[PDB]
């Protein structure tokens, strides 16, 4: 029937989707050899008798994480050559992932999405998980995104990109990858959700009270967010909103499709014992700047669109009261031409818990996705940081000798600056 | 009832027939010592089509094994299912055909004629009515090509109103064992066009290549090479021993395929051939088989039908499966492969629901197809002939046993007159 297709590009896209697919198979209760001891139809295809196979592609040019999943616990969950591995990395470059080593792998991945989308009609969209910071994630990710944009023109693409952060980058050529990636990611994707790193790490410090988590807890939290976002697609509820009715609410102009998100409550076994979490206070914690996973303070921002999907037992009566409390709050600001900026979605099924994770199970939670004006300073920081190393040609000889031309750096300057001026002309 | 008479010819024919008698035997559920095991009416009610009684309930196949060297026949008594055949059904050659068509057909094979007729007529007239024959032989060597085509040149004019299907293993463009390639290939084929009812082309070079992507294994032995052939060997004649909603037999298969008497060379292929990694991950259904058997890359012959054009296609589906899902799904492949099919024949295909699935598999299909794509494989054999015949090379061994330069030039002239209809039926 009606289905959705996932794509994972880059190493960050790999084990983020590993955290996603373990949680999807945990929610449906399916034992991950395929057997169950029709709501799974959109994320899993039936194979034979009782077996279910994920509808996703794994894609990274090194085999160090692709063969890790292949030899790992889900060898019999993921189909073996749904996973595509290359031979050499993109070496933290847009250029290698887009020009030379991308040819040998996009022809196979295009064959895999044709075999995965021609099986049934009624496709909702695509779920691309990638990293802007990844050389393969931005390199091979952008070549994949533009090819699926021209071929699949009128289909939507939910994107989840690991944006670089102000303090850490864990790459010296990192802002070079960031400017060029959004140079073409602006015009080909339909919607992209922005996820920084130590905003989530500070989330794990503050309200999850753990002082040294790893990429485990970075990927558990991203898996909760996408699952509560797509919870209306698989599971039935009181007020269901689907993929095609997200851009109509959150995207007022086709230029602006970059936005923040947060999930509440972020609690452990110490908090579910001690604090009551009602509808009027979980939305206040969701609108707290501490829960922001892009470390952007919205007080000097301005909200313009928000979808408040609640997962778990809630009623329309008390969620409308919680909406009215946020509107009457003086510190939070809205834009004057959007009197209605809250589009609440309601599900019924309780949020799941991964056994062994720090999260304690909660049966009402808020995922909220919010287009605002505050994104401008996050990207203008990225523009200023790039300009210092573009002053006297830092790390440009790798790109030039690869096959791109000096001037694609400069064209990406006024396209990100056009995105800067677009943010400040809607913030008036 | 309807009797099919099987012949193993040459080293390749003996080895490929051994695997087919292994896959038929366990398809009918039969222990290799002769005793039936498996407890079903539906695999035992039609056993006389291929087999014979032995007044103990034992079943012996209607197969004669004929070969001019004792080497590879000693291997098939030594191997599994070697006790299944009749000892009289073997006929021996103690000399060994040394890759020469001349001692295959004229000189050394002449003294084995009076023994091979006495064993094929003994098996034929013992039944009430014969249906057809089915031989397996290769055009590469001498005891398969020359000693095998000598069988067609005699069995037809003594049993005129019958048919036979010859599964000819054809040589390679790239790899080359049996260094005297074009002489044995051409000398068998000009007889084979005139005097054989249909020919299935089987290509080793290509069937390594199915074994390298869709079955994708690194170490291909001759065992599973012949096992992939024996699937389409079995599927082309499955409804002779099995019931079905829409039936098919060999005589029908000839009537609605061959339009003109001088084209009877057929592609062959078996679907599904699913990779070992992909075994559990295919909820196998009719749409994905149809694209697999209308897939050029999955053809046992080393000819690409993108260049060619299917004159008539045929598909013997097998198993519990819907019948209109055969019908309008092939109307979809005509409407999408419009240029891949001949425009002066509408509805170019067979549909045939063999109601019995293959051995272990729920549902499958066996594709046989008259294609004009074989013209490129027939012309490279032609220029392989001419490149070595201008220099008169490798001719002294042939001429010493009663050949002629004259008889070689109607072999090439019948070769060119065989190719000739293919590019003007495009």
């Amino acid at each position: 029937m009606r289905e959705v297709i996932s794509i994972h590009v880059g190493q960050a896209g790999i084990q983020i989707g590993n955290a996603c697919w373990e949680l999807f198979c945990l929610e449906h209760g399916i034992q991950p050899d395929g057997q169950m001891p029709d709501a799974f139809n959109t994320f899993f295809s039936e194979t034979g008798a009782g077996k279910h196979v994920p509808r996703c592609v794994f894609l990274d040019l090194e085999p160090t994480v692709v063969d890790e999943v292949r030899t790992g616990t889900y060898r019999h969950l993921f189909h073996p050559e749904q996973l595509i591995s290359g031979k050499e990395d993109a070496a933290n470059n847009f250029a290698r992932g887009h020009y030379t080593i991308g040819k040998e792998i996009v022809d196979l991945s295009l064959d895999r999405i044709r075999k995965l989308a021609d099986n049934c009609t009624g496709l909702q969209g695509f779920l691309m998980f990638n990293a802007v910071g990844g050389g393969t994630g931005s390199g091979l990710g952008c070549l994949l995104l533009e090819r699926l944009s021209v071929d699949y023109g009128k289909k939507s693409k939910l994107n989840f990109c690991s944006w670089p952060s102000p303090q850490v980058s864990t790459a010296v050529v990192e802002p070079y990858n960031s400017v060029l990636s959004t140079h073409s990611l602006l015009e080909h994707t339909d919607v992209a959700v922005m996820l920084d790193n130590e905003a989530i790490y500070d989330i794990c410090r503050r309200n999850l009270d753990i002082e040294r988590p790893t990429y485990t807890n970075l990927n558990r939290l991203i898996a909760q967010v996408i699952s509560s976002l797509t919870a209306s697609l698989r599971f039935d509820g009181a007020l269901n909103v689907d993929v095609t009715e997200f851009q109509t609410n959150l995207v007022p102009y086709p230029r602006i499709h970059f936005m923040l998100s947060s999930y509440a409550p972020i609690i452990s076994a110490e908090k579910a014992y001690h604090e009551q979490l009602s509808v009027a206070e979980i939305t206040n914690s969701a609108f707290e700047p501490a829960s922001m996973m892009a470390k952007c303070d919205p007080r000097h921002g301005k909200y313009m669109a928000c979808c408040l999907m609640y997962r778990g037992d809630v009623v329309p009566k008390d969620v409308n009261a919680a909406v009215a409390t946020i509107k009457t709050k003086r510190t939070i600001q809205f834009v004057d031409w959007c009197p209605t900026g809250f589009k609440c979605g309601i599900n019924y099924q309780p949020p799941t818990v991964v056994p062994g994770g720090d999260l304690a199970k909660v049966m009402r939670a808020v995922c909220m996705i919010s287009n605002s004006t505050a994104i401008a300073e996050v990207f203008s920081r990225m523009d200023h940081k790039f300009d210092l190393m573009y002053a006297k040609r830092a790390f440009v000889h790798w790109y030039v000798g690869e096959g791109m031309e000096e001037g694609e750096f400069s064209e990406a300057r006024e396209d990100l600056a056009a995105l800067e001026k677009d943010y400040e002309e809607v913030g008036i | 009832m309807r009797e099919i008479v099987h012949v193993q010819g040459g080293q390749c024919g003996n080895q490929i027939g051994a695997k087919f008698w292994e896959v038929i035997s366990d398809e009918h559920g039969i222990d290799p010592t002769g005793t039936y095991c498996g407890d079903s009416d539906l695999q035992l009610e039609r056993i006389n089509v291929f087999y014979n009684e032995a007044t103990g309930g034992r079943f012996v196949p209607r197969a004669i094994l004929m070969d001019l060297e004792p080497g590879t026949m000693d291997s098939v008594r030594a191997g599994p299912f070697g006790q299944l055949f009749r000892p009289d059904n073997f006929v021996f050659g103690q000399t060994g055909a040394g890759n020469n068509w001349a001692k295959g057909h004229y000189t050394e094979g002449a003294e084995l004629i009076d023994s091979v007729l006495d064993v094929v007529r003994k098996e034929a007239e013992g039944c009430d009515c014969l249906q057809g024959f089915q031989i397996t032989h290769s055009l590469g060597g001498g005891t398969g090509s020359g000693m095998g085509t000598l069988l067609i040149s005699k069995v037809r004019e003594e049993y005129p109103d019958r048919i036979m299907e010859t599964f000819s293993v054809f040589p390679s463009p790239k790899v080359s064992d049996t260094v005297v390639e074009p002489y044995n290939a051409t000398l068998s084929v000009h007889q084979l066009v005139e005097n054989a009812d249909e020919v299935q082309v089987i290509d080793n070079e290509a069937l390594y290549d199915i074994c390298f992507r869709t079955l994708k294994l690194t170490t291909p032995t001759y065992g599973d090479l012949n096992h992939l052939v024996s699937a389409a060997m079995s599927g082309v004649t499955c409804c002779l021993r099995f019931p079905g909603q829409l039936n098919s037999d060999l005589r029908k298969l000839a009537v609605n395929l061959i339009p003109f008497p001088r084209l009877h060379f057929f592609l062959i292929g078996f679907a599904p051939l699913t990779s070992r990694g992909s075994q559990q991950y295919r909820a196998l259904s009719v749409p994905e088989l149809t694209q697999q058997m209308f897939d050029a890359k999955n053809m046992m012959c080393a000819s690409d039908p993108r260049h060619g054009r299917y004159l008539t296609a045929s598909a013997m589906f097998r198993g519990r499966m819907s019948t209109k899902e055969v019908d309008e799904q092939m109307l979809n492949v005509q409407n999408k492969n419009s240029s891949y099919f001949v425009e002066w024949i509408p509805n170019n295909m067979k549909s045939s629901v063999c109601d019995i699935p293959p051995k272990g598999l729920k549902m499958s299909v066996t594709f046989v197809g008259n294609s004009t794509a074989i013209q490129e494989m027939f012309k490279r054999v032609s220029d392989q002939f001419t490149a070595m015949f201008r220099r008169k090379a490798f001719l002294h061994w042939y001429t010493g046993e009663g050949m002629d330069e004259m008889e070689f030039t109607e072999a090439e002239s019948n070769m060119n007159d065989l190719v000739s209809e293919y590019q003007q039926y495009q």
Partner: peptide, 22 residues
């Protein structure tokens, strides 16, 4: 071309394991 033991990941390692263990 160098061919190695089936317990290393080079070319198609997945079913250098399953039909013919070494």
């Amino acid at each position: 071309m160098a061919i190695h033991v089936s317990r290393t990941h080079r070319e198609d390692y997945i079913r250098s394991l399953t039909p013919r263990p070494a």
